[PDB]
Paper text:
Therefore, the diffraction intensity and radiation damage were not directly comparable, and the diffraction data were collected from a single crystal by rotating it 360°. The diffraction data collected from 1, 2, 3, and 4 X-ray exposures of SeMet-RmSBP crystals were designated Dose I, II, III, and IV, respectively. For the Dose I dataset, images 1–6 were missing. Accordingly, the number of images for Dose I deposited in ZENODO is 354, and the number of images for Dose II, III, and IV was 360. The resolutions of Dose I, II, III, and IV of the structure factor and coordinate deposited in PDB were 1.50, 1.58, 1.68, and 1.75 Å, respectively. Doses I, II, III, and IV were 1.46, 1.56, 1.63, and 1.70 Å, respectively, showing improved resolution compared with the previous report (Doses I, II, III, and IV were 1.50, 1.58, 1.68, and 1.75 Å). As previously reported, with an increase in X-ray exposure, the diffraction limit and I/sigma of SeMet-RmSBP tended to decrease, whereas Rmerge, Rmeas, Rpim, and B-factor tended to increase. As the X-ray exposure time increased, the negative electron density map at the Se atom site of SeMet concomitantly increased; however, a negative density map for other atoms in SeMet was not observed. The results indicate that the Se atom is more sensitive to radiation damage compared with other atoms.
Typical SBP proteins recognize a substrate using two α/β domains, whereas the single-domain substrate-binding protein from Rhodothermus marinus (RmSBP) has a single α/β domain. The crystal structure and flexibility of RmSBP have been established, but its molecular function is unknown. Recently, radiation damage to the selenomethionine-substituted single-domain substrate-binding domain from Rhodothermus marinus (SeMet-RmSBP) was investigated. Global and specific radiation damage from four datasets collected by repeatedly exposing a single RmSBP-SeMet crystal to X-rays were analyzed.
Numbering used by the authors: 27 to 182
The structure:
């Protein structure tokens, strides 16, 4: 319900100064032909380079994440959905741990990720976007809340 471009405009204010972000995308997720071109348009619009690494199985997760970190030096990890591989505990755990140990915040699709260490997720209420934040991790990572959302932010 929060579109990819809305999400990336939020990320710009949540981690100000970010210039490069990595997306781990499940090759078996629905809507690739919509989402992946939208991410490139979101990149041009926000000024944040978006690098996508696609994965189909758990053995692809580690090598594809390392490519995001060493080849592209991304500054955060962004996960857009969790219907399949990215809803499995082992993939979630691996991605949060390795992002965090590289100094990267994780922007995540659901509160399950926050319960495990991701920083921010989002929802769309009748009054618009509302932010859900892992207070402990977000404070450590230097996450900043845009003024418009100061009153529309819940802590896990």
């Amino acid at each position: 319900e929060v579109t990819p471009i809305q999400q990336l405009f939020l990320i710009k204010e949540l981690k100000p100064g970010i210039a490069r972000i990595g997306v781990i995308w499940d090759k078996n997720a629905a809507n690739r032909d919509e989402v992946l071109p939208q991410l490139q348009r979101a990149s041009a619009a926000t000024g944040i380079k978006v690098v996508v690494a696609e994965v189909a199985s758990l053995q692809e997760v580690a090598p594809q994440f390392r490519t995001l970190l060493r080849d592209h030096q991304v500054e955060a990890l962004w996960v857009l959905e969790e219907s399949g591989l990215l809803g499995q505990a082992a993939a979630r755990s691996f991605l949060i741990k390795n992002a965090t140990q590289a100094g990267m915040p994780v922007f995540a699709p659901s509160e399950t990720w926050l319960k495990e260490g991701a920083c921010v997720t989002w929802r769309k209420d009748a009054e618009g976007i509302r932010l859900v934040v892992n207070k402990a991790v977000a404070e450590a990572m230097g996450i900043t809340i845009p003024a418009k959302y100061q009153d529309r932010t819940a802590f896990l």
